[PDB]
Amino acid sequence: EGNVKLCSLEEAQRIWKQKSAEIYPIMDKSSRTRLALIICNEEFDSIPRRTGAEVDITGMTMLLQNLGYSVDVKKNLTASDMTTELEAFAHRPEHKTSDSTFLVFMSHGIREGICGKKHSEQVPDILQLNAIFNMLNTKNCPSLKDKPKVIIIQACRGDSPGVVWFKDAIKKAHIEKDFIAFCSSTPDGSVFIGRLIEHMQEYACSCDVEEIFRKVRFSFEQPDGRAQMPATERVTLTRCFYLFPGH
User: Catalytic site residues?
Assistant: First the structure.
């Protein structure tokens, strides 16, 4: 399974000093109610089965639990069902007494969206990326205002970027803020999810999530399988999100 390295009292002190307190605050361990949602589509009407899905669900579930999240897992949804689930997730009371969330999507994709179980050329079944952000934004999810919302999107695409060959009384709040997305389109557990888990395990103690994502990219810098170069996207974090594993 691997092991999430903990942030020592010493490391935590270092982190708070160096970033001038521009860090997202964490709530008390014994009262906070952190939630995470995994939506995984493995079985589809018209597109290939994603056979490594159960290994990926297991790994992401155990990781997120080890980082302090209660994890819901939903499987084999249409875009409509994903929409319903995301709206419900946004309204969960636990977010009020949480400091953060993770949402993980694992499916096939197209350039502008995630495939639902019924997706076909002739009859689309697509969850737009915009919809995810809209449903979790400050209006629709006030409970996560000013709290980091980490969106992991594995949406496997036949046109994933590849390679080139060479020789040799009222107040205003921002509608959308405190998001970060990390996006993989590489098709065929899966290589991307495995590498992400390894890096979270090794570096959550010492690195903020943005830096962990960079390190994942660094680990993939030389292509060998189908090319992996997962992009960080749609970043409106204003502070560093350290997971402080063990706290």
Answer: 108, 156
